[PDB]
Amino acid sequence: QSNKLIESSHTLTLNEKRLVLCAASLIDSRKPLPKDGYLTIRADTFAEVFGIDVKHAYAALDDAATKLFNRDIRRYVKGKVVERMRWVFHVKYREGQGCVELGFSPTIIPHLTMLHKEFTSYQLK
């Protein structure tokens, strides 16, 4: 069902995985989903949460958001792609505020906490 999202995440680069999980973590499973799926991700906190030097953190998010934006998750039947979907449909780079804005697709934002719960369950150490 939603395992596909979990499948697709395996194929993402390290920082892309981070970006998505970091966004997930900013969601409150108890309350409603973010308006239109918008979530802001600051470099400093990203750089702290993972072990990165904040001095270059923004560059990292920039590249990461851009790679995510370019992802194309597809479904096939035989050799033909039958369905195409994006993780995000909108990205705002804000080097001034040191953050990036991500608009997660309608069909995506509802599975983010599910992803978060999954990554947590394999967090052994």
In the complex, minimum distance from the CB of residue 31 to a copy of itself, in angstroms, rounded to a whole number:
19
In the complex, minimum distance from the CB of residue 33 to a copy of itself, in angstroms, rounded to a whole number:
12
Q: How far apart are CA 76 and CA 125, in angstroms?
A: 37
Handedness of CA 56, 58, 117, 27 (dihedral sign): positive
Cβ nearer to a copy of itself, comparing 30 with 80: 80
Residue 8 interacting partner from Hg ion, a copy of itself, none (CB closer than 5 to 8 Å by kind):
none
Using CB under 5 A as the binding rule, whether residue 97 contacts Hg ion is answered as yes
Residue 5, H or E segment: helix 3-10
Yes or no: say if 71 and 15 are a contact pair by the CB < 8 Å rule.
Answer: no
> Could you say which residues in the range 3-32 bind Hg ion, by CB under 5 A?
22, 25
In the complex, minimum distance from the CB of residue 40 to Hg ion, in angstroms, rounded to a whole number:
5
